[PDB]
């Protein structure tokens, strides 16, 4: 019933090649005979990437879920047959893979990204089990060296999220060591952190916290689709980062080299680097590995937009605790220009209010800590009284009153600090 | 039974024009004609309407609503007359 129809319509489209892929369009529209449409887009390929990759990427990744399920069931049923148009598709896709693999050229990296996300779609929805040659060529394409363009950043992000997504395509120690040497090469690279470094740091935090559930969500968000991963497949992946690749020392040293989220707010949702920095400061990791977080905290506080992110106040609180705990001493914000200049070039009012909140909370922590510190004289390191004269506390809380709804609990906590510490400003 | 109290103001002939509409959550839009006996007239241009309208339907899985509305009828069609008012109704099974 199927082969005769496929041969008849392929002969008809051979007789009329002008409307040949219009019949592929009717195949997609009617959701009948998928292999016929595959043969139609294969037989008429005699610039860009190719038409086949666009066609099946649109099938698997389109808005229409019925077409996606129909093509996925087609590929799933075609896998069970003895090694027929599905194998022609796979051979064409493989020879397309070798057409760009060397690192990659700066113009072929987007083509490689599109092919790689096509393989994502195939192995995620279709249940396609790649061959040994397919897996070897795919992994060779994983470990390429892009020219560190934003296209290259997208390329390495997709490759890394596929290593997380499909850990069943290595199965060999040689591809394992190739993977980890590529990972170390990507880690020691500096221009990638301008992003990909946020993803690397966040998945390192998630394996250290043994989450392995929003790892799936991050992979699904980066690939842009839902895949069943079976996190027991990621069990060997966790031990590679946890014990060998992303140790606590190197993730702590990476935590300061990641750029801050520019103009972060409650509008910028999702799991941000500020959350990972807050989790590390909760565990006192920076003092445990002698890494300076003062510069990163100041740079993150200096760039904030008019809605208040809910993580900023706990981050400031745990940073102050990290300064004043007897475990060690994180360096406070310096008394000069990073505070005086910050409260004079055109810094945001939320930045000024956050710095004022940090200063007043540091004052209360100092006054509630020296009763039981008994550690060192340089451990408190109190701010100068001449500095506080340059801080318009009443003025800043006056602006904070007018933007109460744009701040989460910052105006409230600043009011509490003012009422406890400066009752002469609360008349 | 549902009791209503309508404050009709400046109605020329409320005896034969003012009608009560009950609208169930389904398509039922039963239209009730009040009798002239309970169109009280406490003043010039002021009228009071006190009817005990009657509501019934089979079982509901949840207390939905009912829509009670006064209507004005003319010699061929009817137009909305009062503010739409929602009343909660819960027909429990026997």
């Amino acid at each position: 019933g199927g082969r005769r129809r496929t041969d008849a319509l392929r002969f008809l489209c051979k007789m009329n090649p002008s409307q040949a892929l219009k019949v592929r369009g009717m195949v997609v529209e009617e959701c009948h005979l998928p292999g016929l449409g595959v043969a139609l887009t294969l037989d008429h390929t005699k610039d860009g990437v190719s038409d086949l990759v666009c066609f099946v990427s649109g099938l698997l990744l389109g808005t229409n879920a019925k077409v996606r399920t129909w093509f996925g069931t087609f590929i799933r049923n075609g896998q069970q047959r003895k090694r027929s148009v599905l194998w022609q598709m796979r051979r064409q896709l493989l020879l397309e893979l070798m057409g760009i693999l060397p690192g990659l050229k700066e113009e072929h990296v987007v083509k490689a990204s599109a092919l790689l996300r096509l393989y994502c779609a195939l192995m995620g929805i279709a249940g396609l089990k790649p061959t040994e040659e397919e897996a070897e060529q795919l992994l060779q394409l994983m470990t390429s060296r892009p020219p560190a363009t934003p296209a290259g950043v997208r390329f390495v992000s997709l490759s890394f999220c596929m290593l997380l997504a499909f850990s069943t395509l290595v199965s060999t120690p040689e591809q394992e060591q190739l993977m980890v040497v590529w990972l170390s090469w990507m880690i020691k690279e500096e221009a990638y952190f301008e992003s990909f470094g946020e993803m690397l740091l966040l998945v390192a935090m998630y394996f250290h916290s043994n989450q392995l559930s929003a790892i799936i969500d991050l992979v699904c968000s980066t690939l842009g689709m839902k895949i069943v991963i079976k996190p027991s497949s990621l069990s060997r992946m966790k031990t590679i980062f946890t014990q060998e690749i992303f140790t606590e020392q190197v993730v702590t040293a990476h935590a300061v080299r990641v750029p801050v989220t520019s103009n972060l707010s409650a509008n910028i949702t999702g799991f941000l680097p500020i959350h990972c920095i807050y989790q590390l400061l909760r565990s006192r990791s920076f003092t445990k590995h002698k890494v300076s977080i003062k510069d990163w905290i100041y740079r993150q506080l200096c760039e904030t937009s008019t809605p208040l992110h809910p993580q900023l106040l706990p981050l400031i609180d745990v940073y102050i605790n990290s300064i004043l705990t007897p475990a060690s001493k994180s360096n406070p914000e310096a008394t000069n220009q990073p505070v005086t200049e910050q409260e004079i070039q055109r810094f945001s009012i939320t930045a000024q209010l956050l710095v004022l909140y940090y200063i007043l909370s540091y004052e209360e922590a100092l006054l509630a800590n020296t009763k039981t510190l008994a550690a060192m004289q340089r451990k408190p390191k109190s701010y100068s009284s001449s500095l506080m004269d340059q801080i318009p506390i009443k003025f800043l809380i006056r602006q904070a009153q007018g933007l109460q709804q744009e701040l989460g609990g910052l105006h409230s906590a600043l009011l509490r600090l003012l009422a406890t510490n400066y009752p002469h400003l609360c008349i | 039974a549902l009791d209503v109290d309508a404050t009709l103001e400046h109605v020329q002939d409320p005896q034969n024009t003012v009608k009560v509409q009950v609208l169930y959550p389904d398509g039922q839009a039963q239209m009730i004609h009040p009798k002239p006996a309970d169109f009280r007239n406490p003043g010039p241009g002021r009228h009071r309407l006190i009817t005990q309208v009657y509501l019934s339907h089979t079982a509901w899985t949840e207390a939905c609503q009912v829509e009670v509305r006064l209507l004005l009828a003319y010699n061929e069609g009817t137009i909305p007359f009062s503010k739409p008012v929602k009343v909660y109704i819960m027909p429990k099974p026997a």
Partner: protein, 886 residues
């Protein structure tokens, strides 16, 4: 949890420390925003009132700030009496600060306690207190309560009057005390008494601050209470022409500006005459500019028709047209342009050229300076000359010519605005485009790299006016533009915007080249697929330009090549569809274009199948298979018309231009269906008096002009060839099959909704009931939805009613067809449906969300959410039913 967070910030207000207590108080508005539940807002407000009653004055001020910030939530507390009573208990405090804070509470709560008489008495008593903060708070409370209650206003009007003429009251407190009379807009006699008091008050206290405040509150009373306006306008004009202070004149000017913005129709001719006479004999440019701003606001309304030869307004506009001040010149030009385009009398023919040359002089003055204030006057002048060109068509040639002559000798930042003006003019009058192409192309050539920041905007605007001006294609100018971008701009965003404008105006070969130049510049593969699809669409529309005339074989070749490229493009376009911002409109529009082109190709195949495949052996009927072929073609084209209509109804976020484009495509396929019907199927039944009343052809674009010209030509050919031939005719196939060529000769225009998503709105539609319901019971669909306005909520349209249609289809038909038009009140709606399931089994129900706008147009936009309902039977009822049946 809501109550858990309420207890979490409730435990802080017995802390004893004032800091944690004010913490607890000021956390309340965030709780109100998170949990807007009346039974919980009630308890929160009652304990806020309790801590107000027992707390110190700073806590009371914190409660006041919370109450001010939560004014929309305090209408839903419903335990008003005890809450207001426990706040009001500390009006009797001997502390004047506490009394002041309570008066500010009462004024803050005046929306929910009008006609509350003890509050009125407390405000009246506190207005006579000896403490300044208490009197100021009483003034604030009186201003709030007078706005919300007319019984408070009628006595407080007399009280405020008697304590204004009371000289024990100081001047500054008088100044604070005048604007209470603004809220006298309740009764006509109340407003009249307030106006009499204000008239005595202005002459009684002729201080500059007193006259400013009294005139402003008199005009706010006159604007709010509408039966005061002509006498207020004449009072303002009298004080503008007689009072010598500049501040009083400035308030009179800005106040007449407010009254002209609000109610321009109530201005008499005498008021405009008096304002013009004020503008003639003033010596100050700062006052004349404001007076001309008021007159230019009045000029754009119907007050000119009430005003109307050469009058004082015309002479004033001519005088201020030639003024050394640029703002005065801009206002005079605006008045002249509004007078010119307002009517068509014989007197304005002289001042038409005056307006043109004043526009040209303002262009030559405002272009070479690059001042921030010069760009505003330049925008005013260019908008005025756009209005002059559109309102009156014949003189547009001189406007275009002076823009072209000014373009070569102006600074760069001025050139973007003149390019915008020239593009706005050229889309309405197409005959002016081709004559200005050479000068604009030379201007494009002489750019090179002679800018660094405005170069990108100037490049995209000047390429835009090239594309609008050139109705035909480009041969060497395209290569010169390509070389200019390649040498100058490596920024691919400028290339993308220029290609976007090219595909907007139908220059598709240029767009194809620019999209080929852009495929290596993107980072995400999604934008790569999007750009590749755009490249293929532009290539296919370029391939459609090979239709010369009457050649149906070359027509088939060009349509086949265009179809090949165009659904290669849709193959690469659906790969760019994302879960977040999918390419839904683009995919539907491209699919409809594919279907239209395929139907065109099938119809040309039927043209050829007239002469080929001769008629059957039969002694309408006796025509062969071609009768059924045109029947199927008519059905396909009518289905295409319905699908273009449902795309129109499903868009709802497009411009007027994109909606007009979709309507044009729908009219195209409707025209083809009617051309089939009226001269193949049934010429006798069809061809009624379908004479389109082609009067004011207000076609906004050149593409629209071409489409309606093609429609008129094809309809005239169909009417002229209605019954002149037998239904199996060579002229019928020829005229229809050349109508195909005439329709496809004009290139397709991709509009803004294809490229930019503005007014992103949707329905969440979170319904609440495979669910199972008993056979005897009726299911209740408590369906609710929230709309999601993105950025501008009402940029093009606004939702008036959300029409929900729900129907039930058994055996997962359509028996529970229900409809309810619910109105969302806070961008949220909720209604409840009653669905009956007598037939046992799985019932697939679906719910639609149609949106009716302010104009009454139905837009089918909402999701089609489906849930399955199972009708399981009671075991007792099943046993009873089987016993009764058997």
């Amino acid at each position: 949890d809501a109550n858990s967070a309420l207890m979490e910030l409730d435990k802080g207000l017995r802390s004893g420390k004032l800091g944690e207590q004010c913490e607890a108080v000021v956390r309340f508005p965030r709780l109100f925003q998170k949990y807007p539940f009346p039974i919980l807002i009630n308890s929160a407000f009652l304990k806020l009132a309790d801590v107000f009653r027992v707390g110190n004055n700073f806590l009371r001020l914190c409660v006041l700030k919370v109450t001010q910030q939560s004014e929309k939530h305090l209408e839903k507390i419903l335990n008003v009496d005890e809450f207001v009573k426990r706040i009001f208990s500390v009006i009797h405090s001997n502390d004047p600060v506490a009394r002041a804070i309570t008066l500010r509470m009462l004024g803050s709560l005046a929306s929910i306690i009008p006609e509350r008489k003890n509050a009125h008495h407390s405000i009246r008593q506190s207005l006579d207190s000896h403490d300044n903060v208490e009197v100021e708070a009483a003034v604030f409370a009186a201003a709030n309560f007078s706005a919300q209650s007319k019984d408070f206003a009628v006595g407080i009007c007399n009280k405020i009057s008697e304590m204004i003429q009371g000289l024990a009251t100081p001047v500054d407190l008088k100044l604070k005390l005048i604007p209470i009379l603004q809220h006298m807009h309740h009764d006509a006699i109340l407003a009249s008494s307030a106006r009499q008091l204000l008239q005595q008050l202005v002459t009684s206290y002729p201080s500059t601050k007193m006259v400013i405040v009294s005139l402003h509150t008199f005009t706010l009373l006159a604007a709010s209470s509408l039966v005061d306006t002509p006498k207020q306008i004449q009072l303002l004009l009298q004080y503008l022409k007689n009072d010598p202070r500049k501040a009083v004149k400035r308030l009179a000017i800005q106040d007449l500006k407010l009254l002209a913005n609000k109610t321009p129709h109530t201005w008499s001719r005498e008021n405009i005459q008096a304002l013009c006479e004020c503008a003639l004999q003033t010596p100050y440019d700062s006052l004349k500019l404001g007076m001309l701003s008021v007159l230019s606001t009045l000029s754009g309304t119907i007050a000119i028709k009430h005003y109307f030869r050469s009058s004082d307004l015309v002479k004033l506009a001519q005088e201020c047209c030639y003024h050394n001040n640029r703002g005065i010149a801009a206002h005079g030009v605006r008045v002249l342009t509004n007078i010119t385009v307002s009517c068509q009398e014989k007197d304005l023919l002289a001042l038409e050229q005056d307006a043109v040359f004043g526009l040209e002089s303002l262009l030559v003055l405002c272009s070479q300076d690059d001042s921030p204030g010069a760009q505003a006057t330049l925008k005013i002048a260019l908008n005025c000359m756009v209005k002059l060109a559109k309102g009156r068509p014949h003189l547009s040639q001189s406007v275009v010519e002076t823009l072209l002559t000014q373009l070569h000798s102006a600074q760069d930042a001025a050139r973007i605005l003149m390019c915008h003006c020239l593009a706005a003019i050229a889309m309405q009058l197409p005959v002016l485009g081709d004559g200005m192409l050479g000068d604009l192309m030379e201007l494009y050539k002489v750019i090179g790299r002679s800018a660094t920041d405005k170069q990108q905007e100037l490049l995209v605007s000047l390429a835009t006016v090239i594309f609008v001006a050139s109705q035909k294609a480009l041969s060497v100018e395209s290569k010169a533009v390509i070389k200019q971008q390649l040498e100058s701009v490596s920024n691919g965003w400028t290339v993308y915007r220029i290609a976007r404008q090219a595909s907007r105006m139908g220059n598709h070969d240029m767009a194809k080249e620019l999209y080929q130049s852009l495929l290596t510049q993107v980072a995400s593969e999604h934008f790569y697929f999007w750009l590749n699809s755009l490249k293929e669409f532009s290539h296919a529309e370029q391939c459609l330009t090979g239709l010369q005339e009457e050649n149906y074989s070359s027509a088939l070749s060009c349509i086949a090549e265009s179809l090949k490229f165009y659904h290669k493009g849709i193959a690469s376009l659906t790969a760019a569809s994302t879960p977040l911002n999918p390419l839904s409109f683009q995919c539907e529009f491209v699919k409809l274009r594919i279907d239209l082109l395929q139907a065109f190709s099938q119809l040309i195949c039927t043209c050829n199948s007239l002469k080929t495949s001769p008629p059957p052996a039969i002694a309408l009927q006796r025509c062969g298979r071609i009768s059924n072929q045109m029947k199927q073609s008519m059905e396909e084209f009518r289905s295409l018309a319905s699908r273009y209509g449902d795309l129109y109804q499903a868009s709802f976020d497009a411009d007027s231009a994109t909606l007009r484009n979709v309507e044009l495509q729908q009219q195209s396929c409707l025209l083809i269906s009617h051309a089939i019907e009226a001269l193949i199927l049934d010429p006798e039944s069809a061809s009624f008096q379908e004479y389109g009343s082609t009067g004011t052809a207000h076609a906004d674009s050149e593409y629209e002009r071409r489409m309606m010209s093609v429609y008129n030509h094809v309809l005239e050919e169909v009417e002229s060839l209605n019954r002149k031939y037998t239904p199996v005719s060579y002229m019928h196939t020829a005229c229809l099959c050349n109508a195909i060529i005439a329709l496809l000769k004009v290139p397709l225009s991709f509009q803004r909704y294809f490229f930019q998503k503005l007014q992103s709105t949707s329905i969440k539609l979170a319904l609440s009931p495979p669910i199972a319901v008993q056979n005897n019971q009726q299911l209740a669909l408590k369906v609710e939805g929230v709309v999601q306005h993105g950025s501008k909520p009402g940029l093009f349209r606004k939702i008036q009613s959300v029409c929900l249609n729900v129907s039930s289809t058994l055996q997962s038909n359509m028996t529970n067809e229900m409809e309810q038009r619910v109105e969302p009140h806070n961008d949220y709606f909720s209604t409840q449906f009653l669905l009956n399931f007598a037939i046992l089994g799985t019932h697939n129900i679906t719910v639609e969300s149609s949106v009716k706008d302010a104009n009454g147009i139905v837009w089918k936009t909402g999701p089609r959410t489906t849930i399955f309902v199972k009708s399981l039977e009671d075991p007792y009822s099943q046993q009873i039913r089987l016993q009764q049946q058997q």
